Structure formats: structure tokens, C-alpha cells
């Protein structure tokens, strides 16, 4: 994993944001309830 402070999230230009650093070891526990995926393309007929 990597950490990035300056974040433009939702891409809107003209305004950025900086996330101040947090003192010390950071720990967060998360529970994964969902997913988002995409598919490939024709490739080979009824193959994979």
C-alpha cells in the first residue's frame, strides 16, 4: 500500500485538497461487503 496526501478526488480541477498526516502507526479494520467489476472482450469464441 501507498499513502498520498494531496488528493483531487472526484477529479474536479481548480481545487485540490491536502490530507494532513496522522501521528504514528495508523490501523483500521474493515469488513468487505461489496465489489465492482468489468469484463474483457470478444477474444476467442466461447473460450474464457
Amino acid at each position, epitope marked *: 500500500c501507498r499513502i498520498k496526501q494531496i488528493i483531487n478526488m472526484w*477529479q474536479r*480541477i481548480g481545487q485540490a485538497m491536502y490530507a494532513p498526516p496522522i501521528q504514528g502507526v495508523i490501523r483500521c479494520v474493515s469488513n468487505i461487503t461489496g465489489l465492482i467489476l*468489468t469484463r*474483457d*472482450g*470478444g*477474444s*476467442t469464441n466461447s473460450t474464457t
Partner: antibody, heavy 126, light 108 residues
Framework: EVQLVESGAQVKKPGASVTVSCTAS????????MHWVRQAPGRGLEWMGW????????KYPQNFRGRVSMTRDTSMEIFYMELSRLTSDDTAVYYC???????????????????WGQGTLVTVSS | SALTQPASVSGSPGQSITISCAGS?????????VSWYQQHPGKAPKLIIY???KRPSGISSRFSASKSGNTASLTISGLQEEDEAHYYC????????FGGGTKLTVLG
């Protein structure tokens, strides 16, 4: 109006790599898909992929996957495309095209190609 | 190319011609997504038909197209010298599927 302007024709050695740009203008850049198509001389159209400017979402085809590096500069409004491991079979004229209907919120399409790049001739000879 | 087109079509100036796009039910039959492009020699391809029949803004009313089952068709009436050029039928089968392309000429 809108315009799709690509880079210049290049002459390179085989096995090397080549990058080609496209610079759109006159519309909302971050919200419009960009197709890339090469046409070998006398051949038909060969679709090489597309890049959604929104966060940079890309999808390529099967036969071109792994030699194709396609990006865009949303700041400077310049699409990019790259082909490596140059072979004589990779010599063609490469285009960039936009899908018909776009937006910043909902989407669709597939079919649409309206605005077309002028083409860029990449030559591979030893 | 996954879509079948004629190699060349010749017709007399002023007549009507039909260009066929034929494929499986994966593209032509099971989708409305067939589209057609004009290309002048040495210049970029230009869209002509989409949605199996549609005309983008600024296409001559003489042009039109359709799809019959697994076979899609293109039609150009009022033929003129500006129409002598390459035409390619595109349809979507999960990818981008094209036609081989067809050349237009004068007949007689």
C-alpha cells in the same frame, strides 16, 4: 467545433517502441470516450482500444493487448497511445476517434465514432 | 473482419446500390448496433450510418441503411462522384467488429 489532432509520422527500427498522441479540444474533455484505430495500407479498420478520460478507464481488444499503452493528460487535454516490439506488421496509419454521446454523469455508448484523427504513419523497416 | 461485406460494388451514376453486412446473431441479428462509415482515399474515415439505420448531422438524405435478421444492409440513392470511396460496416459483438470494406465505382 471539436478537433482531434495526432502526432507526426515516424520512421523507426524494428523491435523498438513508438508513442502516438491525440489532442482533443472544443468540448468537455474528461467526459468523452476516445477510440484508437489503425488501418494498414489497403486493409480494413483495426480497433485498438479506448480510454475513458474519467479517471482514465481503459478497455483494449484481445489481439492488441500487451503492446498497447493508451493514456490521456486531462490537464493538457492530450490522449496518448504507444506500441512496442515494433514489427513490419505493425506499420499502419493510426487514428483516434470519439464516441457519439457522452456526458459527465450517465453514459452509454459503444457504436459511435464521429470525430476522427487525421492519422499517423508509423513505419518499421530494417 | 467478423462482418461480411462485398469486395467491390459498381453502379451507374444516379442509381441505387445496396451494400450487405452479414454475420451471426451475435452482432447483426441480436443487436441494433450496426453502423457504417465513409472513407475518402487518403483521408480519415467518416461516419455515415449507425444504430443499424441512423444519419449523423450533415449526412445527405440519399443515404440510409437497415438490418434484415442476421444481415444488415446499406443503401445510397442519388449517386454522385462525391460518393466514390470506401464504406465499412461496423457492429458490436462484445468488441468492435468491422467489415472488410467495399469500393464504389462507375458501372456500364
Amino acid at each position: 467545433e471539436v478537433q482531434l489532432v495526432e502526432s507526426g509520422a515516424q520512421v523507426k527500427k524494428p523491435g523498438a517502441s513508438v508513442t502516438v498522441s491525440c489532442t482533443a479540444s472544443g468540448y468537455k474533455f474528461t467526459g468523452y470516450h476516445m477510440h484508437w484505430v489503425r488501418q494498414a495500407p489497403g486493409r480494413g479498420l483495426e480497433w485498438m482500444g479506448w480510454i475513458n478520460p474519467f479517471r482514465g478507464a481503459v478497455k483494449y481488444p484481445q489481439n492488441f493487448r500487451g503492446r498497447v499503452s493508451m493514456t490521456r493528460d486531462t490537464s493538457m487535454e492530450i490522449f496518448y497511445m504507444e506500441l512496442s516490439r515494433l514489427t513490419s506488421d505493425d506499420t499502419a496509419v493510426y487514428y483516434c476517434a470519439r464516441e457519439m454521446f457522452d456526458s459527465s454523469a450517465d453514459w452509454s455508448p459503444w457504436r459511435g465514432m464521429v470525430a476522427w484523427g487525421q492519422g499517423t504513419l508509423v513505419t518499421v523497416s530494417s | 473482419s467478423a462482418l461480411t461485406q462485398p469486395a467491390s460494388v459498381s453502379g451507374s451514376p444516379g442509381q441505387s446500390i445496396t451494400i450487405s453486412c452479414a454475420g451471426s446473431s451475435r452482432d447483426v441479428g441480436g443487436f441494433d448496433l450496426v453502423s457504417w462509415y465513409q472513407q475518402h482515399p487518403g483521408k480519415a474515415p467518416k461516419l455515415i450510418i449507425y444504430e443499424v439505420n441512423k444519419r449523423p448531422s450533415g449526412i445527405s438524405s440519399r443515404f440510409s441503411a437497415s438490418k434484415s435478421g442476421n444481415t444488415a444492409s446499406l443503401t445510397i440513392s442519388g449517386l454522385q462522384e462525391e460518393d466514390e470511396a470506401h464504406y465499412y460496416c461496423y457492429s458490436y459483438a462484445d468488441g468492435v467488429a468491422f467489415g472488410g470494406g467495399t469500393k464504389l465505382t462507375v458501372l456500364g
